[PDB]
Amino acid sequence: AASGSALIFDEEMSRYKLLWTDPECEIEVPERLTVSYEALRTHGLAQRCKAVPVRQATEQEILLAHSEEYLEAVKQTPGMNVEELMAFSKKYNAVYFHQNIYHCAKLAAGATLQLVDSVMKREVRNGMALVRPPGHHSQRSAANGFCVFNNVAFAALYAKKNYNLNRILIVDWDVHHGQGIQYCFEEDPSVLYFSWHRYEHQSFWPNLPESDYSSVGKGKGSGFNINLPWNKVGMTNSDYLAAFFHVLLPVAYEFDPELVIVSAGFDSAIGDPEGEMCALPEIFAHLTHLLMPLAAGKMCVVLEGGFNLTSLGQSVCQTVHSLLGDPTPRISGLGTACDSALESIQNVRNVQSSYWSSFKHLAQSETNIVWPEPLKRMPASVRTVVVPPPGVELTLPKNCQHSISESTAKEVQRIRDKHFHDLTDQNILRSLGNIISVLDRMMRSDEVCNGCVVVSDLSVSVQCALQHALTEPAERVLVVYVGDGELPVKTNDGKVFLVQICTKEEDKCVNRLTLCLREGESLTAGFMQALLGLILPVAYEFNPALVLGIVEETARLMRVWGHMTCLIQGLARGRMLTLLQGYDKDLLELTVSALSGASISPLGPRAPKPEDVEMMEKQRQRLQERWGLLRCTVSESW
Ligand SMILES: CC(=O)NCCCCN
Ligand SMILES: [K+]
Numbered sequence: 001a002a003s004g005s006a007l008i009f010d011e012e013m014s015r016y017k018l019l020w021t022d023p024e025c026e027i028e029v030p031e032r033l034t035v036s037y038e039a040l041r042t043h044g045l046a047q048r049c050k051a052v053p054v055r056q057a058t059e060q061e062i063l064l065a066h067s068e069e070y071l072e073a074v075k076q077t078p079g080m081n082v083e084e085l086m087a088f089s090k091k092y093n094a095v096y097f098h099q100n101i102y103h104c105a106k107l108a109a110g111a112t113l114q115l116v117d118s119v120m121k122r123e124v125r126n127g128m129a130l131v132r133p134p135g136h137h138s139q140r141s142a143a144n145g146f147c148v149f150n151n152v153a154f155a156a157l158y159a160k161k162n163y164n165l166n167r168i169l170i171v172d173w174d175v176h177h178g179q180g181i182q183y184c185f186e187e188d189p190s191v192l193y194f195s196w197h198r199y200e201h202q203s204f205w206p207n208l209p210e211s212d213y214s215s216v217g218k219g220k221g222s223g224f225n226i227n228l229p230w231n232k233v234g235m236t237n238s239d240y241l242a243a244f245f246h247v248l249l250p251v252a253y254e255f256d257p258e259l260v261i262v263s264a265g266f267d268s269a270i271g272d273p274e275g276e277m278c279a280l281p282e283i284f285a286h287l288t289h290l291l292m293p294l295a296a297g298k299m300c301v302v303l304e305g306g307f308n309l310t311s312l313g314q315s316v317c318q319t320v321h322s323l324l325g326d327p328t329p330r331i332s333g334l335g336t337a338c339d340s341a342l343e344s345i346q347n348v349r350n351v352q353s354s355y356w357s358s359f360k361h362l363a364q365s366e367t368n369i370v371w372p373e374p375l376k377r378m379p380a381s382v383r384t385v386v387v388p389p390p391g392v393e394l395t396l397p398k399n400c401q402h403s404i405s406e407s408t409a410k411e412v413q414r415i416r417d418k419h420f421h422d423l424t425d426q427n428i429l430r431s432l433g434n435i436i437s438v439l440d441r442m443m444r445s446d447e448v449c450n451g452c453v454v455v456s457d458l459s460v461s462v463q464c465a466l467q468h469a470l471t472e473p474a475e476r477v478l479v480v481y482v483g484d485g486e487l488p489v490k491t492n493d494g495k496v497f498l499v500q501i502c503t504k505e506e507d508k509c510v511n512r513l514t515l516c517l518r519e520g521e522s523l524t525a526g527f528m529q530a531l532l533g534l535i536l537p538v539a540y541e542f543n544p545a546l547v548l549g550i551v552e553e554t555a556r557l558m559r560v561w562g563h564m565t566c567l568i569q570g571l572a573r574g575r576m577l578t579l580l581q582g583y584d585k586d587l588l589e590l591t592v593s594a595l596s597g598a599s600i601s602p603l604g605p606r607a608p609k610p611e612d613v614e615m616m617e618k619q620r621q622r623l624q625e626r627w628g629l630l631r632c633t634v635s636e637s638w
């Protein structure tokens, strides 16, 4: 199984720049690359990546996406003087040429292809290419918007040709529309393109009618182009995460790509002069994290734009941190998307409702500048500690470890002699020492991040885990419970949110999300739909300090548990304690595997039950006034 993250970079791509006055182009500078790599070096991230050399894209590789006439014309720019380079540049929109830019464009393209090969040959899990010039605006026969050749379009076409891939997802979180990518694949259903972008009702460059939400692709490609226009500046973390939970992710997990390519422009970050958005660099840690369960983690991140040298370095670092599996930073202050974003979100969901299962219920009435410096991120010495039943030894990943001090044993006796007088079952009393011992390593030590304990008696286990977390203190605790019945969990004072997956149904508490999913073959689609559209929005807004997972022994869990514990590690810096009632070798191994940051096997294929969709939207109705990140329509004003 693949391990490690590639970092592809070369100083040569910094050796072309603008040679005449042009305020439109002067923001695209060599230092974008140098500042980004040096930021990775400063924080020790570059040294943890597998360096892979750049190469030149060949002529034949360039012809995958560009015309012979355009290549031939660009191939002549190395021989041009300054006056001739200016005249050549003025044939195109917002792009400049330089004696060395043709060379650098072939390197940017070759670097991208190197990244695709390293990931697809399983030599690395994932990676990032820091390249200049950017690519996503370039077109079959035109340079455009600082881009000469379309690096990310190359990558998808190359992955199709050489690895026979049938489904590729391109995520373009740059603040500009990648119209070159859209045109490239607009008729191709094998490539799903998603783009958000500053649009302002077509008044923002590149001012194209087809960058609007109504361009869904053409022909056999209808539905595989998703545009989410931002019609006001100042979009925040909440807007970006609402886009992901309510548009991108439901479509991505349904599509089930075999490879993910990110057009990663960080001009969507606070401080950027082109974007004027307000999302913090930390959000890219989560945008990366939320996509990593796709395609068994095979993700190729390719630099596009980003022009505030400081937000640029910090957002690059947050992305590589997540590629390396480091714990995600906590995002505070999340809430409803703004009205203009909710309007863009409802509009794209409505037009896409003809093509995607997650949105299908919408089609019928019956169903319907300064910001703080990012904190340090670093992997735990031992990421995951495990406490199997006594005697059971397992083959653990190299970053896991098996489980009991005297300090702890006195605490268990104190807890026993106060709250469980009649308790003598020394197997339960063992698990209490394990829970307290594991939690203390999780909360106190930076050396342990999360853990999993097998228990026998849920009530005493859950009470001791929760109460020990709440007095540490962990300001807030998110409980995720798979099972029926009521637990010793009080959700009245706002310190606990309880997500419960059951079979019965329910309650009026707004600190509680109960999901009664009908048994059958459609539960996997239903669970994933609840996870992305309900569980994750609430969990993100709640912002817990610890996540407590609980699985009843009586409980189609194996198919989705791994996706949940991977995605839920976006909360609480990955600090999750899972209690498994009873020994199940497979469930315990999958839990440890996902907690430790291993790749998750893809879901494959379908469509969920209408009764389940109805049940889920009733929950959204009931909760979205308190938890606004749940909202995916504009609220009705009085
Ligand atoms: C790569 C990129 O972000 N290009 C933006 C072009 C701006 C034109 N005003
Ligand atoms: K974009």
Ligand SMILES: [K+]
Binding pocket: 185, 186, 187, 188, 189, 190, 191, 192, 193, 217, 221, 224, 225
């Ligand atoms: K397409």
Ligand code: NA
Binding pocket: 089, 090, 092, 093, 094, 095
């Ligand atoms: Na110009």
Ligand SMILES: [Zn+2]
Binding pocket: 174, 175, 176, 265, 267, 304, 305, 306
């Ligand atoms: Zn851009």
